[PDB]
Design a binder for this molecule. Structure first.
Ligand SMILES: [Mg+2]
Ligand SMILES: [Mg+2]
Ligand SMILES: [Mg+2]
Ligand SMILES: [Mg+2]
Ligand SMILES: [Mg+2]
Ligand SMILES: [Mg+2]
Ligand SMILES: [Mg+2]
Ligand SMILES: [Mg+2]
Ligand SMILES: [Mg+2]
Ligand SMILES: [Mg+2]
Ligand SMILES: [Mg+2]
Ligand SMILES: [Mg+2]
Ligand SMILES: [Mg+2]
Ligand SMILES: [Zn+2]
Ligand SMILES: [Zn+2]
Lengths: 91, 135, 69, 114
RNA sequence: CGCCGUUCCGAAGGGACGGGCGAUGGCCUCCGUUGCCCUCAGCCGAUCGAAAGGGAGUCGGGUUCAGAUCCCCGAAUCCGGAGUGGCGGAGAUGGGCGCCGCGAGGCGUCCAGUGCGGUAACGCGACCGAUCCCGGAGAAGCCGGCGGGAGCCCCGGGGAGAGUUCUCUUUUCUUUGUGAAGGGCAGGGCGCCCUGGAAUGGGUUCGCCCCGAGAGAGGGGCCCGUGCCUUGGAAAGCGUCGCGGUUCCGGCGGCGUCCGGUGAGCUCUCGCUGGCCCUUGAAAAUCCGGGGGAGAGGGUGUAAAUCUCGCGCCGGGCCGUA
RNA sequence: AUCCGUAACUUCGGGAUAAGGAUUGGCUCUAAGGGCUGGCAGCCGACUUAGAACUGGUGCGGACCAGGGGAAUCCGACUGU
């Protein structure tokens, strides 16, 4: 059955810290504990070892990722930007 | 098509002789009752001849040119096939699968390969075959 | 302690220059021959009484032999 | 029931003060001090999580009095690298060395035309 | 007076396989030693800092008025040393050719021989090798769940001694061993191998979780085995009954030390798997493997260099300990 | 402890053991919940739960252990010092 109506994972904190902070941290708690698909092997095993460090239990490949998400929007934008400049550097 | 044929140079991947180079003598792609899997009889170099240079005497060169060979039957999965071939004529009356019944025949099978390898080594042909893979 | 299985090896043990004494212990089921060498106490367990008597009379000379009671 | 005491002056439950119970010929329970648990070697590949096989799992200074056969495996890198990653280096070393010849031949062949 | 500073403004190495020159020696044969030279050389920080951290290796029984894992008895082990450091085993005793014979085998020659087994995981008693390089161990938090093994508790019976017995109680109580180290085997674990190719997806846990990057199913391999058997070792210890003696004897004898069950039980321990961290949970001494192949070893033998194999030989000083 | 029942308010997590009731002994039974071996038969077994009769001068969580509760106001969010 559905046990909570809205708190979800942040139900571990009971009534403490205020609704808005619990609401805000709920997005991170889900993301930082999710298992992401590993781009190197495909098994849904990529898990966070520490803040910024993401490890896959299948192929053992460790990746420097985001604090709470596997890759950040800023980092993904920079990779495309660095790709384009490289092409326009060597044509 | 099929390429695991006699004369093919292969790299042993697993076992005591892993990383050594051998040459397929007999290949059985369908197996037998004793070996349901596909396998080959290969003869290879247990110990490679040491590097020689003009600075050494004849006695030193001969000492460093000896080869320790081995005879084995291998699963195809344990051999990496290369594109090199070595056409050393090995007497199949002594280099065959019956050499594994007793050591006396196996000693004469490894002896036969040792003499043929050394003779072909000193001609300077098949240099890649007699150089140890560095891994 | 080491356990010897065959009379052939025990006799070799008892002839070692560092073998000191042989104690014979008679139990209800077996006869045990123990030789005190330098490192180990080797033991031979013989279940046949006749062989135990035969082995007893065929020990090397000069070795102290003791019967335990 | 019988209650136990340490047999040494270290009265604390430290990592070097672990014990196990032992009944003796005198028919009493005493403490025997256990040796630490040894660890088998970890593969030099740094990738495989498991430890190696064919090697005694003993404390580092106990390897001094073991024979060689107990400390390695009959194979290249045996006792220092796992078989799985040894197969991979032979292929990698061979396959990479071949690509150099392929690249080199084209370089000379392209230069030949040039 | 001194202080700051600990690698920072320093010519910070007194070492080494090997080679070359001499001086000496001894089992004077040939091997040592020594001095100089050649060659090679990161560690980059003197030293101190833990009787709870790291750190090889000792357990059982007896013994005193008071000490014992220290004394005695018994059984082991680590480390260091010996090459006048001994023996065995390994390296290592093969093949071709030609003569002798019926053969077994034997002579003369010419070649090989720094071991071998398994498809593999890996196994076998050793199984050469330096400077140099790579790695492993030491060496890693907290919490949960689950499982294996022990000690203990509990249940059913056999013994031996004791209590109760006015009535009842085949009753109640006590007690009913086996060390380290070696060998063998259960058991537990494996992210180890081989065959094979899986959807009508299957396997699977309390939860999970796992699979074409190879699942199920077969057959193997390895690690720990603190559990049981065995050598130890019944000779000892203990229970009970009975005899002696100086009677302050490790005194002497009889019998016994047996057979099963069970558990979200408690304590310890090993292992598997998970959760938590904007927290990620020592270092070093010290030990080991691997890569390489500079070198050395003998010419077919009374074989050599060599050996992390099995035995054998010698030693372990100082301080604490009631 | 078992069974039932539980409001305002709320940051929907709580409030909450809210509040409020009933039951509880002893004894004799019934039913269900497993393992081993060769939809069945045999032999093992370990504690639980529920139900019923009977029963005592209504006494039964019999000692021990063991929250009183509700409606509000002020202050500080909380745990911590
Ligand atoms: Mg091994
Ligand atoms: Mg110090
Ligand atoms: Mg200390
Ligand atoms: Mg300490
Ligand atoms: Mg002693
Ligand atoms: Mg499978
Ligand atoms: Mg035991
Ligand atoms: Mg007795
Ligand atoms: Mg090597
Ligand atoms: Mg004291
Ligand atoms: Mg209230
Ligand atoms: Mg406050
Ligand atoms: Mg304070
Ligand atoms: Zn991956
Ligand atoms: Zn690996």
């Amino acid at each position: 059955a559905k046990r909570t109506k809205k708190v979800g994972i942040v139900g571990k904190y009971g009534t403490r810290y205020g609704a808005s902070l619990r609401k805000m941290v709920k997005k991170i708690e889900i993301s930082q504990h999710a298992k992401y698909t590993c781009s190197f092997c495909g098994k849904t095993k990529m898990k966070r070892r520490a803040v910024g460090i993401w490890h896959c239990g299948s192929c053992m490949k460790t990746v420097a990722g985001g604090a709470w998400t596997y890759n950040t929007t800023s980092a993904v934008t920079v990779k495309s930007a660095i790709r384009r400049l490289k092409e326009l550097k060597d044509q | 098509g099929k390429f695991m044929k006699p004369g093919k140079v292969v790299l042993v991947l697993a076992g005591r002789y892993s990383g050594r180079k051998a040459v397929i003598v007999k290949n059985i792609d369908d197996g037998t009752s004793d070996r349901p899997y596909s396998h080959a009889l290969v003869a290879g170099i247990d110990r490679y001849p040491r590097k020689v240079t003009a600075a050494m005497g004849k006695k030193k060169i001969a000492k460093r040119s000896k080869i320790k060979s081995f005879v084995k039957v291998y699963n195809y999965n344990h051999l990496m096939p290369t594109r090199y071939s070595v056409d050393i004529p090995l007497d199949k009356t002594v280099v065959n699968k019956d050499v594994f019944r007793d050591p006396a025949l196996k000693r004469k099978a490894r002896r036969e390969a040792k003499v043929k390898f050394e003779e072909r080594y000193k001609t300077g042909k098949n240099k890649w075959f007699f150089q140890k893979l560095r891994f | 302690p080491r356990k010897i299985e065959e009379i052939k090896d025990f006799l070799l043990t008892a002839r070692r220059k560092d073998a000191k004494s042989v104690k014979i212990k008679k139990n209800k089921d077996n006869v045990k021959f123990k030789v005190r060498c330098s490192r180990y106490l080797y033991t031979l367990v013989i279940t046949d009484k006749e062989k135990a008597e035969k082995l007893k009379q065929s020990l090397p000379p000069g070795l102290a032999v003791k019967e335990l009671k | 029931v019988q209650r136990l005491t340490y047999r040494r002056r270290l009265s604390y439950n430290t990592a070097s003060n672990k014990t196990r119970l032992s009944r003796t010929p005198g028919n009493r329970i005493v403490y025997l001090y256990t040796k630490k648990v040894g660890k088998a070697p970890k593969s030099a590949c740094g990738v495989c999580p498991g430890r190696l096989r064919g090697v005694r799992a003993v404390r580092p200074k106990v390897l001094m009095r073991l024979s060689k056969t107990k400390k390695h495996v009959s194979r290249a890198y045996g006792g220092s690298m796992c078989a799985k990653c040894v197969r991979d280096r032979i292929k990698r070393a061979f396959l990479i060395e071949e690509q150099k010849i392929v690249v080199k031949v084209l370089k000379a062949q392209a230069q030949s035309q040039k």
